[PDB]
Design a protein around this ligand. Structure first.
Ligand SMILES: Nc1nc2c(ncn2[C@@H]2O[C@H](COP(=O)(O)OP(=O)(O)OP(=O)(O)O)[C@@H](O)[C@H]2O)c(=O)[nH]1
Ligand SMILES: Nc1nc2c(ncn2[C@@H]2O[C@H](COP(=O)(O)OP(=O)(O)OP(=O)(O)O)[C@@H](O)[C@H]2O)c(=O)[nH]1
Ligand SMILES: [Mg+2]
Ligand SMILES: [Mg+2]
Ligand SMILES: [Zn+2]
Ligand SMILES: [Zn+2]
Lengths: 136, 131, 96, 100, 263, 65, 249, 99, 244, 145
RNA sequence: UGGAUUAACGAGAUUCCCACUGUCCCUAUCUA
């Protein structure tokens, strides 16, 4: 889960195992991200932790603002590029994996997200539904 | 399904959906903006020397000089010729929003396409003047 | 020596032995118990499984995320023509 | 409950069929099936593939600009749910199907 | 595993030579071992050799000894297998020290210090053959060993040590060559560090380099000039950063720091 | 709550209506609960208990002498 | 930390600390070793016992050190407050005793393990085990008085209120039996005594109240008698240091 | 401080501008709120306030609310009817329109 | 009349509610506590609508509208479009839009006379808003911050902007609006101002932890309680400059 | 060496036996299971025209998908529509018993009200629910004139 | 203090970066 995620999140596919390199979506200056652990994971021998859309992970800027590295910050996925199943049945998917940086309560670091954002992620976190312009 | 098609047209290896390309070619200010393109450092040519019909960053002046005179770029030049297959093509070819289809194709056949072709002409002349 | 890392057992031991059934008609082993004041009513019914299809239903599931929203999901279709009675059988309870 | 026309096949795709791809320009391309999904991926031309309504309806095959084919505009002004209106609609829809 | 051999040579040694490097003695001392030495075994006197002196001009080669000899011998000596200036101050100091223990039948003496300071090199210059490996690689020798010379002064060396403080450095840890530059995944995030440490003149004089600013532009300049470009066209930043740091360590770029000057 | 708040509470409202007949009976019953814990309490809790009670009886003998 | 430290675990008295840590090393380590096993296995058995016991004590102590509010160099108001309250001298010297004991038990373990890697028989190593553990035991048995003091200082400072030194304040002071607490109880939501006797309180009582949508704290003090600043109480020097440091009406 | 006064001048100095045209702009207060009497938590003569409905029906996670039953049509009788939403194909709504 | 409340356990009232001088849209999550708090003072004067936009609860930041009419995004389904249609009376010209960006509530902050709009809105919409909403549009940006929807609340009385609005840009915006502005802050220091409160000509609902200072300042600018007409903003200068 | 799709250490030193819980190879499938708590969505009449139609679809169609079910004929008699799967493949005889207790889950009290019953073809990727639809969409063919 | 610090070549030894991938998450399917 994570704190600040309003309401319960059903299960969607797991597109971003640990080691994935997604994009940074907001205008915080970070250019891309790296996932080092996904919060709320399970616990199973050999099962790589994996991240879905709307999840909150622990990312590190692999390349970006020269003044942001060496630290690890909570990130929130907003695109996935692995066909997940919407409920009113249609398997949809995106063009690439991308997330936004937020302080652990859920509040945006940057100011505006560029690109479409998952409807499920925007529904779950109410601070993406405020700093997003294109809800899927 | 085998290897070529998948390890080429994978979601990590996309082109730029030539409806976007044609949109970017219709309007003169977009032509000039994507043509000047203040220097960046990741893209291979570092900004300049970039084909606007395709979506590729040719490395150098000579590289683009030859790229324009080829069968790939000519293939895409002819690919970008007519109405670029909006969703409304596929939704009016089934008896739905046929009026929106007609208005759009009317605009293209009468108002937008002339400026598009005129601008690809002017862009060719500019590519020459630089090259 | 003990075990280094722990993982649950692979499989379920309640379902053993994993052997072919005794028949195709799997048998009912327990019946809704009884009540000798309800009107007589059957407790079981046997039919034939025929395929599986899809459905979209509107959800009235208060307090749920999909309240007043549509939901698509699968259904099985079992083909159950009328069943017809041919005998009765009575069972007495013995200390065996 | 909003039957969509495949972006490529122009067929109908009912709830639960096919895949949808959302472009970074936020355009939802729906597909009737994997044939059309993969042809889209390979970037073919639905106006040069011979088996698809885009090619037909504007390649000399079955007609397009017809007085029957002007009743299916996506309505964006939703007025009022009148019962007699629904009744006349239900008659007229089958009438249209037969005439076309 | 390392501090073990360290105390093995401290105990089996009749005297200790704490090899510093000329370019940064105040950073490669970090003693907290002499405090232990003086008190648990006072009869070993911690000679100092300031190795790789030439990378420090004669001026600082005097300044860095003038205010430390007031503690220990402190014989600053750059090592070299044909021209080793600084050996004719210590090859006889240690030997007279050997004579002093005339009721010992021998003497055994041991080298200590940071890794990649020059201990194997000092053995090899005082012996005149590569009996131990010289290697720009920081951790080259991984076990102590005895070495015979003069049949009275036995010599021993140990692998390098780092007083484990969780403070005062990560960047100067990387700047002393103790960890190989093939074991850090972030090699370009310290090029700003080298460009804040060393000034711009010798940066310009070395490669040479294009007229520049901005260590990131510096790295792209290096790479476009060197032909370290990947598949179009963004060049090998990791590789060029690793080269700049190999330069930094092996001493292909001049550097030093200044103490209180000539009074 | 600032200072000695439970004591201010006890003086203002009181204790449970039966905190006295519970304490009394707990005490009177501890005499029984001591032997129960001595005839049960196997295996090193019995050792700790026995050594502790030996300590106690020693201290009480010290005190009365 | 600051502002009503209530985050300090609990200081079990010395016999209970001994019980807790020793029983813990008895339960959470293997306890069956036979004379027949390899001498390496025996040495390892007893090494693990000693190191584990050391770690357990050390964490029990490190908790107290990292927990207590660290009287000196916090804020002069609170510094002098716990001065008048819990005897600054005793405070610092008790906590220092605890730090010394922590170092001592770390040393005990780190010597006896270096020893045990030279034991040669189950009996030699069993004797070393009992020896190190008994030395740690007396080291801790010394700590009777510090811990008995710390339990009460903890159960007191936890209750102790939290007045910010700098927000808008309102101090209430004067002689006993005059009406300090009457005013406080009559102005702001609190529970302070009103009974007709002299020292109707014995420590600083607080109460917030709002004004212009802003927060103002009010502080009733016990009060002062004549007391020519030579003889006073921990009752009076609290009001003293309050009226001193806190800057308001 | 002499770097915070100017910083808070933002929120201090708020503009009453000049309306920059001839046109007018007024607060639209509906007549429907005037006669509306304020709500009371104590008085028994307070409104029904559908929280009361979901409490007395009822359950905070069980009340199946009637999302119909409050919308304004010609006759209420067919407010509890159904929209067809589809036919032999070609979803109904796209053909629905007056005339 | 500055009636703080809380969606299920969130203070961002503006992302789960949409309020105007003729109707209200509230999400259908969970229970009728939020909606009951609305109906507590809104009552029966203005129509309330339990609703859903594209099958989510975030409606206040997907729709956008004034008392002349409503404007809903693309991906709303026709069924819920019809639900809104029946629910609201005839005046509210509900209408879908075809747009590049769905979150209209974050790109158009509006009131019954004028609507600022995110810069890259299209021309068809630039005139469609005039068509239905009944205003005049100006592309803008609230002090660099694009997405004018969630960084400048607004009513027919005055507007509240996120605290980093510079004074000169504030003068430009106030000239555009012909009505006051205040660089506000809600919910213990949430920059996003429009997405933490909903407000109109007789009411404002903000979060719960919105402290009394900020509640009081917005009350002064919005002239809700009786009566605080924008001079009390200068009356309370004895507090707002000390608190910072 | 000597196999990879297996288990490596099928036993400790002691015992000198394989325990009944080591999970070796052998017959999979054809067991006799019992799923519980399956919801009955629709009891379809057998004489009725327009089964697969609801109060929304209102297009006359029966629940047999185009070209019948696969490896099974078409539906004619009274049927049951159960949410989810059910053990056993098509053509197989299943038994439906009723619930053995009083389920206290609101998923047992809720009322289902379907909206549309997919009746496309299951034999290949079908897209039209009725042959009338298929015909209307494709238009006439060479054969019919 | 009369014997000392290196291109090319390499089935030589070690470490690393790019491309790439069923090595792995986590297995699935086909052919002889
Ligand atoms: N310029 C210069 N380089 C030196 C000098 N001494 C040693 N070096 C070089 O620096 C490297 C240091 O490696 P070593 O000779 O092994 O000395 P070290 O510091 O003990 O390194 P390790 O033995 O591996 O711990 C050597 O390989 C030489 O190449 C010196 O005096 N001047
Ligand atoms: N009638 C009357 N009596 C008052 C008034 N103010 C104070 N008093 C008297 O003062 C008493 C209040 O006692 P406290 O407020 O406890 O004074 P205190 O004992 O110094 O309180 P502490 O310092 O907290 O211990 C009341 O019982 C009154 O007798 C007043 O305004 N009217
Ligand atoms: Mg070295
Ligand atoms: Mg009193
Ligand atoms: Zn080209
Ligand atoms: Zn096809």
């Amino acid at each position: 889960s994570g704190n600040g995620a309003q309401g319960t999140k059903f299960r969607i596919s797991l597109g971003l195992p640990v080691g994935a390199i997604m994009n940074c979506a907001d205008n915080s200056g970070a250019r891309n991200l790296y996932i080092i652990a996904v919060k709320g994971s399970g616990s199973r021998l050999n099962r790589l932790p994996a991240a879905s859309l709307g999840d909150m992970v622990m990312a590190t800027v692999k390349k970006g603002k020269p003044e942001l590295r060496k630290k690890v910050m909570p990130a929130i996925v907003v695109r996935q590029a692995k066909s997940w199943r919407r409920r009113d049945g249609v398997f949809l998917y995106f063009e690439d994996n991308a997330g936004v940086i937020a302080n652990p309560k859920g509040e945006m670091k940057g100011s505006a997200i560029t690109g479409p954002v998952g409807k499920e992620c925007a529904d779950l976190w109410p601070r993406v539904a405020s700093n997003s312009g294109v809800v899927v | 399904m085998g290897r070529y098609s998948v390890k080429r047209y994978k979601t990590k290896r996309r082109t730029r959906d030539l409806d976007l390309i044609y949109n970017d070619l219709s309007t003169k200010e977009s032509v000039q903006k994507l043509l000047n393109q203040p220097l960046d450092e990741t893209k291979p040519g570092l900004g300049q020397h970039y084909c606007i019909h395709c979506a590729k960053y040719m490395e150098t002046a000579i590289a683009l000089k030859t790229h324009l005179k080829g069968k790939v770029h000519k293939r895409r030049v002819k690919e970008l010729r007519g109405v670029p297959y909006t969703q409304e093509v596929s939704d009016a070819a089934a008896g739905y929003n046929l009026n929106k289809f007609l208005n759009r194709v009317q605009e293209i056949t009468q108002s937008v396409g002339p400026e598009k072709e005129s601008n690809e002409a002017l862009l060719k002349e500019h590519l020459d003047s630089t090259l | 020596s003990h075990r280094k890392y722990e993982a649950p057992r692979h499989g379920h031991l309640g379902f053993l032995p994993r052997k072919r059934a005794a028949s195709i008609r799997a048998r009912v082993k327990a019946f809704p118990k009884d009540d000798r004041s309800k009107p007589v009513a059957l407790t079981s019914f046997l039919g034939y499984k025929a395929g599986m299809t899809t459905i979209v239903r509107d959800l009235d599931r208060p307090g749920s995320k999909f309240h007043k929203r549509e939901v698509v999901e699968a259904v099985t279709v079992v083909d159950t023509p009328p069943v017809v009675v041919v005998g009765v059988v009575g069972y007495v309870e013995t200390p065996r | 409950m909003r039957i969509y026309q495949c972006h490529f096949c122009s067929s109908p795709c009912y709830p639960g069929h096919g895949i949808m791809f959302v472009r970074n320009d936020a355009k939802e391309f729906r597909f009737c099936r994997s044939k059309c999904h993969k042809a889209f991926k390979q970037r073919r031309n639905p106006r040069k593939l011979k088996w698809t309504k885009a090619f037909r309806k504007a390649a000399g095959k079955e007609l397009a600009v017809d007085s029957t084919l002007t009743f299916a505009q996506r309505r964006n002004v939703p007025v009022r749910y009148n019962r007699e209106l629904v009744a006349t609609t239900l008659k007229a829809m089958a009438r249209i199907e037969e005439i076309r | 595993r390392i501090w073990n051999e360290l105390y093995k040579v401290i105990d089996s040694s009749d005297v200790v030579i704490h090899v510093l490097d000329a370019r940064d003695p105040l950073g490669t001392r970090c003693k907290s071992v002499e405090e232990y030495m003086k008190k648990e075994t006072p009869h070993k006197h911690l000679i100092y050799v300031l190795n790789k002196c030439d990378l420090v001009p004669t001026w600082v080669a005097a300044a860095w000894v003038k205010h430390l000899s007031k503690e220990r011998p402190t014989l600053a000596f750059h090592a070299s297998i044909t021209n080793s200036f600084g050996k004719g101050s210590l090859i006889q100091l240690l030997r007279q020290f050997s004579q002093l223990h005339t009721d010992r039948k021998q003497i055994s003496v041991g080298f200590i210090g940071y890794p990649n300071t020059g201990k194997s090199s000092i053995i090899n210059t005082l012996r005149k053959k590569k009996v131990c490996q010289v290697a720009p690689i920081p951790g080259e020798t991984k076990v102590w060993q005895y070495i015979t010379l003069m049949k009275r002064i036995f010599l021993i060396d140990c692998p390098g040590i780092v007083p484990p403080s969780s403070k005062d450095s990560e960047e100067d840890i990387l700047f002393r060559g103790v960890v190989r530059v093939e074991h850090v995944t972030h090699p370009e995030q310290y090029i700003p560090g080298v460009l804040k440490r060393c000034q711009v003149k010798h940066l310009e004089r070395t490669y040479e380099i294009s007229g520049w600013k901005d260590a990131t532009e510096f790295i792209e300049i290096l790479a476009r000039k060197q032909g370290r470009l990947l598949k179009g066209g963004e060049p090998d930043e990791s590789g060029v950063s690793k080269q700049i740091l190999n330069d930094f360590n092996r001493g292909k770029i001049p550097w030093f720091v200044l103490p209180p000057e000539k009074e | 709550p600032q200072n000695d708040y439970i004591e201010r509470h006890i003086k203002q409202h009181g204790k449970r209506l039966d905190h006295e007949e519970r304490k009394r009976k707990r005490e009177a019953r501890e005499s029984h609960k001591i032997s129960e814990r001595a005839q049960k309490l196997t295996g090193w809790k019995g050792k700790q208990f026995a050594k502790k009670r030996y300590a106690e009886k020693v201290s009480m003998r010290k005190k009365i002498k | 930390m600051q502002l009503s430290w209530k985050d300090i675990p609990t200081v079990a008295p010395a016999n209970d600390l001994l019980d807790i840590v020793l029983n813990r090393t008895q339960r959470k380590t293997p306890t069956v070793i036979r004379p027949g096993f390899k001498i390496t296995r025996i040495r390892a058995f007893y090494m693990r016992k000693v190191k584990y016991t050391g770690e357990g004590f050390v964490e029990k102590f490190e908790d107290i050190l990292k927990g207590f509010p660290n009287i000196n160099d916090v804020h002069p108001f609170h510094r002098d407050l716990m001065d008048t309250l819990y005897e600054k001298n005793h405070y610092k010297i008790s906590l220092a005793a605890i730090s010394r004991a922590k170092s001592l038990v770390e040393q005990v373990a780190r010597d006896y393990v270096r020893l045990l890697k030279f034991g040669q028989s189950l009996f030699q190593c069993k004797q070393l085990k009992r020896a190190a553990l008994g030395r740690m035991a007396t080291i801790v048995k010394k700590l009777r008085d510090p811990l008995a003091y710390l339990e009460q200082v903890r159960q007191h400072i936890g209750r102790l209120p939290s007045i910010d030194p700098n927000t808008r304040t309102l101090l209430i002071c004067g002689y006993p039996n005059v009406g300090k607490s009457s005013f406080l109880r009559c102005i702001t939501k609190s529970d302070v005594d009103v009974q007709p006797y002299a020292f109707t309180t014995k420590s600083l009582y607080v109460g917030h109240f709002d004004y212009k949508y802003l927060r103002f704290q009010a502080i009733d003090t016990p009060g002062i008698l004549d007391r020519p600043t030579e003889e006073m109480n921990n009752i009076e020097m609290q009001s003293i240091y309050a009226i001193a440091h806190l800057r308001s009406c | 401080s002499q770097s915070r006064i100017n910083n808070v001048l933002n929120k201090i100095h708020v503009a009453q501008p000049q309306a920059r045209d001839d046109v007018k702009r007024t607060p639209f207060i509906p007549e429907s709120v005037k006669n509306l009497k304020k709500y009371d938590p104590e008085d028994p003569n307070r409104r029904k306030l559908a929280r009361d409905i979901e409490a007395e029906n009822g359950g905070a996670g069980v009340f199946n609310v009637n999302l119909k039953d409050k919308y304004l049509l010609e006759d209420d009788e067919w407010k509890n009817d159904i929209m067809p939403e589809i036919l032999d194909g070609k979803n109904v709504y796209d053909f629905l329109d007056p005339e | 009349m500055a009636t703080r409340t809380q969606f299920e356990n969130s203070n961002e009232i503006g992302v789960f509610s949409k309020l105007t001088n003729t109707y209200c849209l509230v999400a259908v999550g969970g229970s009728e506590n939020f909606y009951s708090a609305f109906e507590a003072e809104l009552g029966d004067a203005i129509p309330i609508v339990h609703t859903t936009i594209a099958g989510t609860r975030i409606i206040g930041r997907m729709t956008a509208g004034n008392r002349r009419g409503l404007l809903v995004p693309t991906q709303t389904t026709d069924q819920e479009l019809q639900h809104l249609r029946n629910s609201l009376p005839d005046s509210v010209k509900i209408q879908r839009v075809e747009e590049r960006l769905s979150a209209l509530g974050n790109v158009i902050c509006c009131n019954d006379y004028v609507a600022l709009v995110h810069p890259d809105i299209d021309r068809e919409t630039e005139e469609l808003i005039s068509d239905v909403l009944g205003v005049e549009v100006f592309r803008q940006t609230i002090s660099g911050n694009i997405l004018v929807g969630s960084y400048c609340s607004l009513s027919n009385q005055g507007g509240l902007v996120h605290p980093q609005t510079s004074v000169q840009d504030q003068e430009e915006l106030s000239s555009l609006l012909q009505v006051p502005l205040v660089a506000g802050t809600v919910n213990r220091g949430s920059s996003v101002v429009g997405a933490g409160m909903v407000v109109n000509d007789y009411l404002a609902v903000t979060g719960l932890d919105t402290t009394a200072p900020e509640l009081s300042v917005i009350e002064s600018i919005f002239r809700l309680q009786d009566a605080q007409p924008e001079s009390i903003s200068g009356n309370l200068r004895d507090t707002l400059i000390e608190t910072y | 060496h000597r196999g990879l799709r297996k288990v490596a250490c099928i036993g400790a030193w002691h015992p000198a036996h394989v325990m009944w819980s080591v999970a070796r190879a052998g017959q999979r499938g054809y067991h006799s299971r019992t799923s519980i708590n399956h919801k009955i969505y629709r009891v379809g009449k057998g004489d009725d025209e327009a089964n697969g139609a609801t109060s929304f679809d209102r297009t006359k169609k029966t629940i047999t998908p185009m070209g019948g079910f696969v490896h099974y004929g078409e539906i004619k008699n009274d049927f049951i529509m159960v949410k989810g799967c059910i053990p056993g493949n098509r053509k197989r005889i299943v038994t439906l018993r009723k619930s053995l207790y009083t389920n206290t889950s609101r998923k047992a009290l809720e009322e289902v009200s379907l909206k549309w019953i997919d009746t496309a073809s299951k034999f290949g990727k079908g897209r039209f629910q009725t042959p009338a639809e298929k015909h209307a969409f494709m238009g006439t063919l060479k054969k019919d004139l």
